Design a binder for these strands. Structure first.
Ligand SMILES: Cc1cn([C@H]2C[C@H](O)[C@@H](CO[P@](=O)(S)OP(=O)(O)OP(=O)(O)O)O2)c(=O)[nH]c1=O
Ligand SMILES: [Ca+2]
Ligand code: NA
Ligand code: NA
Ligand code: NA
Ligand code: NA
Length: 310
DNA sequence: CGGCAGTACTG
DNA sequence: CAGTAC
DNA sequence: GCCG
């Protein structure tokens, strides 16, 4: 990154807007920050800055102040509430609206939340695992988690295909959680297995809490056995084989990559989801046996998971 | 002016 | 539905 | 915040 003296300052503002709920301003910042991380050389001129896609007049003005000053004065006026709002919205299940409500009510610390806040079921689990869910795991541990789910699944039907997606599939050295996608080439067998699979993983002691238990996706909490283990976030999604390529694409990410591909698809009168690539308007589902087919139908060259890490 | 990705789950 | 998350 |  040629422009860390720039982006480090901008990321503080981005986070400030985000926790205060200014979704769209925060997005603009997020995009400019990556555009800046993706230019070869340091930004030298105002007109050099507008050259970058994602950098406008307002942003170029802030980059020049940073270069002539070494600082951005707006950082001096960030509200004192922001660190507390960040603390509260790092509870899984609490977002900006909950954080702002807790702040207005006078809460300032997780001890205040523990002792006086009304928590949803999900938020109580998030709070109990507050530190652990802020930590990333080595990818070797993600491998053990994927294999634990696969062994439990293949025990009930050896035809089940199980693939760890997210940052793991993109090749990262560390993973924030584990994303396991399950299907079956028979197009039928994947149906109704959650109650068995989760009971099996729960009967083990591996699954420690449930956050979301839907018909197709499970989000929860697991811990491998033995000493020195932390609780880890685990997501499991079960899909029909017809949807495997689009589900793999979605679940492998990155999030910014997905948003970018979906935006492109819409410019072309199409629509892309974890279920299907369609024509827009309903529309027609297009046949996508492989991830490569999704890229081809969008007129783009295939990208391996490692180069989707946007 | 107004979209900024599309969908699933909770209560 | 609004809120939250992947 | 940016951009069509
Ligand atoms: C947040 C988010 C995600 N997704 C997709 C792409 C992510 O890849 C995948 C898994 O979601 P995650 O576990 S949160 O993310 P990753 O594994 O990439 O990275 P880490 O966990 O190591 O932090 O769902 C998305 O379409 N829209 C989103 O808004
Ligand atoms: Ca993940
Ligand atoms: Na520009
Ligand atoms: Na949160
Ligand atoms: Na009080
Ligand atoms: Na996940």
């Amino acid at each position: 990154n040629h422009n860390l003296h720039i982006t480090e300052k901008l990321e503080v503002l981005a986070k400030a807007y985000s926790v205060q709920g200014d979704k769209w301003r925060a997005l603009g910042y997020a995009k400019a920050i990556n555009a800046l991380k993706s230019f070869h050389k340091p930004v030298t001129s105002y007109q050099e800055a507008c050259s970058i896609p994602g950098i406008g007049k307002r942003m170029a003005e802030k980059i020049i102040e940073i270069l002539e000053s070494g600082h951005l004065r707006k950082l001096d006026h960030i509200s004192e509430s922001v660190p507390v709002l960040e603390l509260f919205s790092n509870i899984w299940g609490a977002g900006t609206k909950t954080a702002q409500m807790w702040y207005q009510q006078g809460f300032r610390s997780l001890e205040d939340i523990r002792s006086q806040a009304s928590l949803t079921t999900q938020q109580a689990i998030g709070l109990k695992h507050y530190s652990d869910f802020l930590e990333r795991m080595p990818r070797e541990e993600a491998t053990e988690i994927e294999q634990t789910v696969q062994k439990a699944a293949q025990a009930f039907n050896s035809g089940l295909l199980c693939v760890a997606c997210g940052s793991y599939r993109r090749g990262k050295a560390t993973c924030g959680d584990v994303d396991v996608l399950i299907t079956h080439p028979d197009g039928r067998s994947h149906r109704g297995i959650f109650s068995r699979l989760l009971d099996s993983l729960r009967q083990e002691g591996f699954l420690t809490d449930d956050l979301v238990k839907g018909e197709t996706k499970y989000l929860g909490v697991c811990r491998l056995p033995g000493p020195g283990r932390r609780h880890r976030r685990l997501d499991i999604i079960v899909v029909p084989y017809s949807e495997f390529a689009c589900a793999l694409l979605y679940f492998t990410g990155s999030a910014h990559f997905n948003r970018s591909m979906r935006a492109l698809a819409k410019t072309k009168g199409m629509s892309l989801s974890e279920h299907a690539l369609s024509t827009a308007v309903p529309g027609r589902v297009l046949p996508t046996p492989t991830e490569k087919d999704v890229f081809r139908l969008l007129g783009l060259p295939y990208r391996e998971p490692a180069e989707r890490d946007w």
